[PDB]
Amino acid sequence: EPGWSDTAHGVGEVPLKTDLELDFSLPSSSSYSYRRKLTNPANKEESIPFHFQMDKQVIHAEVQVLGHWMDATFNIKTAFHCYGACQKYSYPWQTAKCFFEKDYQYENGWGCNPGDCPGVGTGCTACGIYLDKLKSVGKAYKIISLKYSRKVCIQLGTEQTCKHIDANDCLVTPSVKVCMVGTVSKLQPADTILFLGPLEQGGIILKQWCTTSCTFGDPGDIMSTTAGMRCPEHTGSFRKICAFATTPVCEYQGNTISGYKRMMATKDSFQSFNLTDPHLTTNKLEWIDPDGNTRDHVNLVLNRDVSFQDLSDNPCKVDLHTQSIEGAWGSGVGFTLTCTVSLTECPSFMTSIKACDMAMCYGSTVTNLARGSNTVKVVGKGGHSGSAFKCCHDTDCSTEGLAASAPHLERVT
Amino acid sequence: EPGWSDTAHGVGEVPLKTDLELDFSLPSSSSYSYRRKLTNPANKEESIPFHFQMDKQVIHAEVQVLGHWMDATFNIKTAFHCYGACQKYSYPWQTAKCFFEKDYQYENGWGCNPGDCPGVGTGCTACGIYLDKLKSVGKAYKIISLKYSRKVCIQLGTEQTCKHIDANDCLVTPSVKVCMVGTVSKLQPADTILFLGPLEQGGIILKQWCTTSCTFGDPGDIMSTTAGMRCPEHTGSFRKICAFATTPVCEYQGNTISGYKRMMATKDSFQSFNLTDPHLTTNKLEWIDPDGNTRDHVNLVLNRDVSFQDLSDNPCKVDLHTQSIEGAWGSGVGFTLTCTVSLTECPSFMTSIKACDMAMCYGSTVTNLARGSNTVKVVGKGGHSGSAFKCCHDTDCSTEGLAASAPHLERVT
Amino acid sequence: EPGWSDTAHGVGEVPLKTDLELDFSLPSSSSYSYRRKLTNPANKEESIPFHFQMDKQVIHAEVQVLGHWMDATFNIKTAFHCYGACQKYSYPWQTAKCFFEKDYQYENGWGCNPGDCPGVGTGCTACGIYLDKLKSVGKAYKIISLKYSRKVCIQLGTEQTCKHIDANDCLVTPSVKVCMVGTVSKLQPADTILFLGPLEQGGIILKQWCTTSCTFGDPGDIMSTTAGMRCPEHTGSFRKICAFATTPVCEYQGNTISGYKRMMATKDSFQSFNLTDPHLTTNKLEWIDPDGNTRDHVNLVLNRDVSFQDLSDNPCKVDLHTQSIEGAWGSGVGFTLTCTVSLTECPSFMTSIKACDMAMCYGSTVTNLARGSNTVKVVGKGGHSGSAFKCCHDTDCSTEGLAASAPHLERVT
Ligand SMILES: *[C@@H]1O[C@H](CO)[C@@H](O[C@@H]2O[C@H](CO)[C@@H](O[C@@H]3O[C@H](CO)[C@@H](O)[C@H](O[C@H]4O[C@H](CO)[C@@H](O)[C@H](O)[C@@H]4O)[C@@H]3O)[C@H](O)[C@H]2NC(C)=O)[C@H](O)[C@H]1NC(C)=O
Ligand SMILES: *[C@@H]1O[C@H](CO)[C@@H](O[C@@H]2O[C@H](CO)[C@@H](O[C@@H]3O[C@H](CO)[C@@H](O)[C@H](O[C@H]4O[C@H](CO)[C@@H](O)[C@H](O)[C@@H]4O)[C@@H]3O)[C@H](O)[C@H]2NC(C)=O)[C@H](O)[C@H]1NC(C)=O
Ligand SMILES: *[C@@H]1O[C@H](CO)[C@@H](O[C@@H]2O[C@H](CO)[C@@H](O[C@@H]3O[C@H](CO)[C@@H](O)[C@H](O[C@H]4O[C@H](CO)[C@@H](O)[C@H](O)[C@@H]4O)[C@@H]3O)[C@H](O)[C@H]2NC(C)=O)[C@H](O)[C@H]1NC(C)=O
């Protein structure tokens, strides 16, 4: 009754026929090497070479590049005009990177009038707040997805096998099973990481980082991006100060201190993380976490008996073509690839269809294929503008790929 | 010296007497089936049938139903009355779902007076902001608790055993141990999940969702619930515009754009999750995560020797009665069930007492029972209004159950 | 080719030579005890005593003490002076714990003047909001780091070994390997935990707790610390009410309800956690989580064959001296200890260097030492003012330690 499947990564074994078991925890930032001449195959005249290599864990993050976080100074200036409307004149703050203007139009009923202006209900008094002394204070990225893997190389006799194993996965070679359990994520999807210096000097994790309502003083309030400045809103209140024969003066009741200055005063409240040999290219960040306390559990079984049974073996063949796509690249909501998967050589097949481009894969769907044609939907997260996403099974991908839409990542107002 | 205990789920075994070990990782959205005729019991004339079935992982979430998130339009209108107080008249905005009013009372010292109203320090000018064009944009739930389990069925010969195994737990039958490790939680307790459409189309995870201070423009600002509308506060400032002989006009300095419009502009900043075959009934949401990359580690040991020792075996008997309860159902703080647990047939017993109703269990306490009467406190989370929570050990529950209080889930102001 | 290393905690074994394997899941709040007389060493006349003890899991949190969260009442009062400036007089609100003042100076152009004050553009009207009826409502701590461990004691014959094992780590004695996998963290670094009563009655987890912009009504708005009060900002707007011959009155458009009152109205929206036997000393909180559903996977292997191979064995010797330090204690960003590590008796050595004081260790670096002198940097989190941080390998620490700087944990404005 059990139909064919390749979703289980592992073995059926008989322990009394196991030549060698390794079971151990290993730091993420540690590699591990083991070499031994095995005194079997009960042949004595000839021994069996055995190499096991496990590289340090590499972390891969698909990220949204957010630009440069800016520090700035708050300023306010007043501009009075005796007649006309507030549009009929330009203002000095309009030369600033970020500015917000409130206009008191057609209201100088003596109470608010300079000596030279004998008008009532005319003219305009313009109030403008602007930011200057802008300086870049760090680079920020929002995490779309996180991947954890270790390269593993196995040599049994004169046959070598190397593969990148994802965390909580197993590798199965003809006589060796290697499994990893326990890698846990300190970073989380949608975290914002901030680098006050080069990546090599470590980052800060910020759970509060403004997204939908960026107000001056919020974390991430002033961002300088490739597409120009992103300026914060000012939520305070304006008030026109007036006296006899004196020109009106603007007064603002609101926050004056920038988000960066607010964070540095309590800098030690936030979690840092350190990066060994980070690699940043476009929207991909890879690195090795140097924290020695983060450990995963490693199990190796060397078993050369005929009862050593790879649980994924099957005669099924899968042919793939990419039908359609919807959604966005570089998005935490993601894209959905619609695939046409043809099965031959089996009545049914339970397997995993992935969405991949030239660089890597971004998501995976477990599906139960029937002989002939099937439609499978795969959700991917990550990728970039030039990405042509393909349907893949193992290393076999469809001939043609499909580009996703640009993500909606913009402020309102 | 070791007293009896049933808290350890697992075995003591001798590996050289193990007939069969399976060790493998499996996607959460994958099932697994294995059938084999075992060529033992060294009897040859007769073989041993063996079935192993593992269902896809099911996720169970106890949720707080938050109602419908609403999109709306911001509006402001002015109402002047020449004499009397602002209470002495009704206003058009009072017909709206959400409205906020600020009244300028007894202040028209000429500066603020229409031509027809020759009064000073009398009358009132009422300012009112209201929301209209309300449309439902999705359904939101806050997660109280998360459970992960897989149904497992074992057939050895002509004897079958099926049980739901929780993640990071083991099942022990007479000759089979099955264990699961490594399932990790993407959703977290107190997350808010938002469904812009039917559950089958997936949800959005929102770390920022207003709870204690809902302001217009916040995520979750305007909620339409069974108990009526929940309206956001407006934190901006009002100002009475005045000119000669013209009637006063209200002006507001504050946010105008709704929370929903703010999110959609940056929709791709947030994490989505997808649901296969979701089931929603009252405050319970169950589903299968279709993400193929989420794997758990599965270990099966088939061992028929007399040294195969179930570590939970014991002669102890436990009788239960539900004494008292405090706390709330449907709450992330929870309720505390106070139980009276009588032990017989053992001098002491280390065991787990659970809080359960008709549907499921909601929490568990490990306790060291002494022969005779004991008091045990169990913290549960979840449940609903009709829940009668009982003290249980294994499948044995107390005769009577106790209802918890309603949760405090309300805005102030 | 493989150089020496002690980073792998575990064994190489032959399963057919294993006398006994235990494999089981165990609640965190449960201990486990196993005693058996092993009928080997195939000697029959003499048996082998075997004890295995596993204590309940203990949670250790390095915390930032935040003081007492305060509830308060909002108040506003007005003070008019006919002449002079607003500084020329004191005010009743200046006697309050928290107060904020806005001064309307030199503006009484008749419109705002009491009958007795015949001045224009002179005097001042001072507006002051203050908080009273302050009452402590709980104690709050921000989590810097979390550690999970179980004490384990092994007796084989007449030889005993006890050690605290960290989660996801293994202990290796001459013939026993014990490993733990699967402990997962419910609390997270940078979480804020709030205790409305004694620690024994449980805490509340709050993802939103004000850090960089504390506004009246935010969670954690009013904190009473050892260094005095920490007062919230008020972001609303002021307005001077005026009429004929009457003295001006202040009006505020802003939040009036405190953060504590706002939380209690929706108290059941937040996650609680319970503590068995908590220990608080300065900035260290230790406890046992009584939730019976949290389980870890335990594996014990008893194997007395000569092929039982501890993977960390090595002849290398390491000598340590503490060179320099930068960073802060009690910080989530942490400190960096710079160590001088001398290797002898090996050409190279892959090992872990830790940062420790008298109490415990706070971080760890995996490094590849060359024969002779090396510089290693270790990142630690936690500690306190008197901490002298040392470079350590295993139980061997440097003679002298170095104190870190105080953390920057202050509000601006
Ligand atoms: C692990 O990550 C943490 C967090 O990123 C990281 O902490 C950072 O360490 C750097 C390195 O020392 C700190 O940057 C220094 O800050 C001091 C004062 O704050 C400055 O004086 C330094 O600049 C001077 O020195 C330079 C040295 O050549 C000169 O080139 C320069 O012109 C200046 O004269 C220097 O910038 C930084 O402050 C912390 N970050 C925080 C948030 O505190 C830690 O070092 C990382 N550890 C490891 C082992 O990687
Ligand atoms: C996994 O989860 C994600 C997140 O939920 C999910 O993304 C959603 O996909 C749906 C399905 O296509 C999207 O809804 C569509 O949106 C487009 C434009 O945004 C509309 O044109 C669509 O409505 C039209 O088409 C319908 C088809 O019959 C008609 O009935 C209708 O009348 C309209 O004419 C449709 O609503 C949705 O936008 C996204 N969500 C987000 C946040 O982007 C994804 O599809 C899920 N994947 C799988 C495999 O389940
Ligand atoms: C697990 O953690 C949760 C969260 O901390 C915890 O819930 C708390 O339980 C306590 C204990 O009952 C509650 O405190 C009580 O609250 C009621 C009304 O809210 C008060 O009447 C109580 O005070 C009276 O009774 C005392 C008993 O002697 C008297 O000494 C006192 O003078 C008063 O007359 C009492 O304070 C608390 O409300 C909850 N917390 C929340 C947030 O709801 C739960 O009990 C913990 N469970 C276990 C098993 O530890």
Q: How would you write C184-195 as a 3-class SS string?
A: CCCCCCCCEEEE
A87 CB within 8 Å of a chain C CB? no
Nearest to C274 by CA among B88, A277, B327: B327
* Preceding amide of C41 cis, omega within 30: yes
Given the DSSP bridges, would you call strands C335-356 and C4-5 parallel, antiparallel or unpaired? parallel
B120 CB within 8 Å of a chain C CB? yes
Tokens (6 digits) for B139: 């359904």
Rounded to whole angstroms, how far apart are CA atoms A53 and B364? 43
Tell me the residue ranges of DSSP E strands in B2-115.
4-5, 9-13, 18-27, 32-38, 48-54, 58-81, 98-105
* Residue B48 contacts residue B41 (beta carbons within 8 Å): yes
Using left for φ > 0, alpha for ψ between -120 and 50, and beta otherwise, residue B168 falls in left
* Residue A140 contacts residue A209 (beta carbons within 8 Å): yes
Q: Do B25 and A170 touch (CB under 8 A)?
A: yes
Nearest to C188 by CA among A130, A186, A142, A228: A186
Check pocket membership of A274 for ligand 1, CB cut-off 6 A.
yes
Q: Residue C211 carries which side chain, given as an amino acid letter?
A: T
Q: Do C267 and B166 touch (CB under 8 A)?
A: no
A241 CB within 8 Å of a chain B CB? no
* Residue A105 contacts residue A277 (beta carbons within 8 Å): no
How far apart are the CA of C263 and the nearest CA of chain A, in angstroms? Answer: 19
Chain centroid to CA A325: how far? 21
Among the partner-chain residues A181, A256, A267, the one whose CB lies closest to the CB of C181 is A181
Tell me the residue ranges of DSSP E strands in A39-157.
48-54, 58-81, 98-105, 124-156
Tokens (6 digits) for A165: 């194993």
* Residue C378 contacts residue C401 (beta carbons within 8 Å): no
DSSP character string of B263-327: HHTTGGGSEEE--EEEEEETTEEEEE--BTT-EEEEEEEEE-STT-EETT----EEEEEEEEEEE
Among the partner-chain residues B64, B179, B212, the one whose CB lies closest to the CB of C25 is B179
Nearest to B148 by CA among B270, B289, B308, B243: B289
Nearest to B170 by CA among B162, B181, B160, B178: B178
A317-397 carries CATH number 3.30.310: no
Atom of ligand 2 nearest to the CA of A327: 43
How far apart are the CA of B166 and the nearest CA of chain A, in angstroms? Answer: 17
Bridge partners, B371 (sequence order):
B343
Check pocket membership of A326 for ligand 2, CB cut-off 6 A.
yes
Please give the backbone phi and psi of residue A227, each rounded to the nearest 5 degrees, phi first: -85, 20
Bridge partners, A99 (sequence order):
A130
Rounded to whole angstroms, how far apart are CA atoms B33 and A297? 26
* Preceding amide of B41 cis, omega within 30: yes
Q: Within 13 Å and on the Cβ side, how many CA atoms surround A279?
A: 8
Rounded to whole angstroms, how far apart are CA atoms A381 and B57? 22
Which residue from A335, A336, A405 has its CB within 8 A of the most atoms of ligand 2, so it is best to mutate?
A336
Please give the method by which this entry was determined. X-ray
Nearest to B205 by CA among B331, B121, B119, B289: B289
A266 CB within 8 Å of a chain C CB? yes
Rounded to whole angstroms, how far apart are CA atoms B129 and B298? 59
Using left for φ > 0, alpha for ψ between -120 and 50, and beta otherwise, residue A272 falls in beta
- Between the CA of residue B129 and those of A15, A236, B135, C357, C411, what are the distances in Å? 75, 18, 18, 60, 34
* Residue A390 contacts residue A356 (beta carbons within 8 Å): yes
Q: Do A301 and B181 touch (CB under 8 A)?
A: no
| Helices (runs of H) and strands (runs of E) counted in chain A | 1, 27
Nearest to C195 by CA among C139, C262, C250, C116: C139
Q: Would you state the torsion angle of the CA atoms of residues C273, C274, C275, C281, taken in this order, to the nearest 10 degrees?
A: 50
Most distant pair of Cα atoms in chain B: their distance: 115
Q: Would you state the torsion angle of the CA atoms of residues A223, A228, A230, A231, taken in this order, to the nearest 10 degrees?
A: 110
Gaps in chain B (C to N distance exceeding 2.5 A) after: none
* Residue C320 contacts residue C341 (beta carbons within 8 Å): yes
Third-level CATH fold of A9-62+144-185+287-310: Tick-borne Encephalitis virus Glycoprotein; domain 1 (2.60.98)
Rounded to whole angstroms, how far apart are CA atoms A128 and A124? 13
Chain centroid to CA C381: how far? 9
Rounded to whole angstroms, how far apart are CA atoms A186 and A294? 10
Cite the DSSP H helix spans in C35-185.
none
Interface of C with B in 181-240 (CB under 8 A): 181-182, 184, 186, 204-205, 207-208, 217-219, 235-237, 239
Tokens (6 digits) for B59: 């996720």
Q: Could you tell me which residues come within 8 angstroms of residue A84 by beta carbon, excluding any fewer than 6 positions away?
A: A122, A123, A124
Tokens (6 digits) for A1: 């009754």
Rounded to whole angstroms, how far apart are CA atoms A27 and A296? 7
Q: Could you tell me which residues come within 8 angstroms of residue B10 by beta carbon, excluding any fewer than 6 positions away?
A: B170, B172, B177, B179, B311, C22, C23, C24, C25, C298
Bridge partners, B318 (sequence order):
B343
Rounded to whole angstroms, how far apart are CA atoms B51 and B36? 7
Bridge partners, A105 (sequence order):
A124
Rounded to whole angstroms, how far apart are CA atoms A266 and C213? 11
- Between the CA of residue C272 and those of B193, B380, C120, C201, C238, what are the distances in Å? 20, 11, 59, 10, 39
Helix (H, G, I), strand (E, B) or coil at C87: helix
Helix (H, G, I), strand (E, B) or coil at C212: coil
Query: Which residue is listed with tokens 């409205």?
Result: B99
Tokens (6 digits) for C80: 């008019």
Given the DSSP bridges, would you call strands B58-81 and B170-172 parallel, antiparallel or unpaired? unpaired
Rounded to whole angstroms, how far apart are CA atoms B125 and B111? 13
Tokens (6 digits) for B56: 């896809």
Rounded to whole angstroms, how far apart are CA atoms B2 and B22? 32
Check pocket membership of B272 for ligand 2, CB cut-off 6 A.
yes
Please give the backbone phi and psi of residue B183, each rounded to the nearest 5 degrees, phi first: -55, 125
Please tell me the number of the ligand nearest to residue C196's CA.
3
Nearest to C72 by CA among C264, C261, C265: C261
Rounded to whole angstroms, how far apart are CA atoms C300 and C295? 16
* Residue B34 contacts residue B52 (beta carbons within 8 Å): yes
Which residue from B201, B260, B271, B275 has its CB within 8 A of the most atoms of ligand 2, so it is best to mutate?
B201
Q: Could you tell me which residues come within 8 angstroms of residue B410 by beta carbon, excluding any fewer than 6 positions away?
A: C265, C266
Q: Which of C239, C293, C307 to mutate to test the interface with B (most CBs of B within 10 A)?
A: C293
Neighbouring chains of A at 3+ CB pairs within 8 Å? B, C
* Residue B225 contacts residue B97 (beta carbons within 8 Å): no
Q: Within 13 Å and on the Cβ side, how many CA atoms surround A109?
A: 14
How far apart are the CA of C134 and the nearest CA of chain B, in angstroms? Answer: 19
DSSP character string of B170-227: EEE-SSEEEEEE----SS-TT-EEEESS-GGG-EEEES---SS--BTTSTT-SEEETT
Tokens (6 digits) for A377: 């939907």
Please tell me the number of the ligand nearest to residue A363's CA.
2
Tokens (6 digits) for B346: 């053992």
> Beta-carbon neighbour count of residue B15 at 10 Å?
24
CA angle C345, C394, C151 (to 5 degrees): 145
Please tell me the number of the ligand nearest to residue B29's CA.
2
DSSP B15: G
Rounded to whole angstroms, how far apart are CA atoms B408 and C250? 35
* Residue C83 contacts residue C154 (beta carbons within 8 Å): no
Cα of C327 from ligand 1 centre, angstroms: 9
Helix (H, G, I), strand (E, B) or coil at A86: helix
Query: Which residue is listed with tokens 């005194």?
Result: A39
- Between the CA of residue A48 and those of A42, A310, B116, what are the distances in Å? 10, 21, 108
Check pocket membership of C267 for ligand 3, CB cut-off 6 A.
yes
Rounded to whole angstroms, how far apart are CA atoms A183 and A205? 19
Return the residue whose CA atom lies nearest to atom 45 of ligand 1. A201
CA-based radius of gyration for chain B: 31
Among the partner-chain residues C15, C184, C408, the one whose CB lies closest to the CB of A18 is C15
Rounded to whole angstroms, how far apart are CA atoms B109 and C111? 8
Helix (H, G, I), strand (E, B) or coil at A208: coil
Helix (H, G, I), strand (E, B) or coil at A88: helix
Q: Within 13 Å and on the Cβ side, how many CA atoms surround C345?
A: 7
User: CATH 2.60.40 in chain B, residues?
Assistant: 317-397
Among the partner-chain residues C13, C333, C364, the one whose CB lies closest to the CB of A293 is C364
Q: Could you tell me which residues come within 8 angstroms of residue C252 by beta carbon, excluding any fewer than 6 positions away?
A: C76, C127, C129, C234, C236, C237, C238, C239
Rounded to whole angstroms, how far apart are CA atoms C16 and A40? 15
Please give the backbone phi and psi of residue A357, each rounded to the nearest 5 degrees, phi first: -120, -155
First and final C-alpha spacing in chain B: 61
Which residue from A194, A196, A201 has its CB within 8 A of the most atoms of ligand 1, so it is best to mutate?
A201
First and final C-alpha spacing in chain A: 61
Given the DSSP bridges, would you call strands C124-156 and A284-288 parallel, antiparallel or unpaired? unpaired
* Residue A389 contacts residue A356 (beta carbons within 8 Å): yes
Q: Could you tell me which residues come within 8 angstroms of residue B180 by beta carbon, excluding any fewer than 6 positions away?
A: B150, B165, B167, B168, B169, B170, B296, B297, B298
CB contacts, 8 Å: B111 with chain A: 109, 111
How far apart are the CA of C293 and the nearest CA of chain B, in angstroms? Answer: 6
B259 CB within 8 Å of a chain A CB? yes
Q: What's the per-residue H, E or C state across B115-183?
A: CCCCCCCCCEEEEEEEEEEEEEEEEEEEEEEEEEEEEEEEEECCEEEEEEEECCCEEECCCEEEEEECC
> Beta-carbon neighbour count of residue B60 at 10 Å?
17
Cβ density class A289-325: b for 16+ within 10 Å, e for less: bbbbbbbbbbbbbbbbeeebbbbbebebebebebeeb
Helix (H, G, I), strand (E, B) or coil at C264: helix
> Beta-carbon neighbour count of residue B388 at 10 Å?
15
Q: Could you tell me which residues come within 8 angstroms of residue A315 by beta carbon, excluding any fewer than 6 positions away?
A: A4, A345, A346
- Between the CA of residue C336 and those of A341, B53, C299, C328, C404, what are the distances in Å? 53, 51, 35, 9, 9
Tokens (6 digits) for B100: 């906020």
Nearest to A70 by CA among A269, A268, A261: A261
First and final C-alpha spacing in chain C: 61
Q: Could you tell me which residues come within 8 angstroms of residue B333 by beta carbon, excluding any fewer than 6 positions away?
A: B327, B381, C204, C267, C268, C270, C271, C272
CA angle A387, A390, A392 (to 5 degrees): 140
Return the residue whose CA atom lies nearest to atom 49 of ligand 1. C377
* Residue C258 contacts residue B329 (beta carbons within 8 Å): no
Rounded to whole angstroms, how far apart are CA atoms A196 and A137? 6
DSSP A199: G
- Between the CA of residue C163 and those of C30, C150, C170, C179, C288, what are the distances in Å? 17, 8, 10, 12, 18
- Between the CA of residue C232 and those of A215, B154, C213, what are the distances in Å? 18, 61, 8
Query: Which residue is listed with tokens 């005929």?
Result: A306
Helix (H, G, I), strand (E, B) or coil at C239: strand
Rounded to whole angstroms, how far apart are CA atoms C100 and C96? 10
Among the partner-chain residues C2, C64, C330, the one whose CB lies closest to the CB of A35 is C2
Rounded to whole angstroms, how far apart are CA atoms C149 and A68? 41
Q: Do B365 and C253 touch (CB under 8 A)?
A: no
Chain centroid to CA A392: how far? 23
Tokens (6 digits) for C30: 């449960």
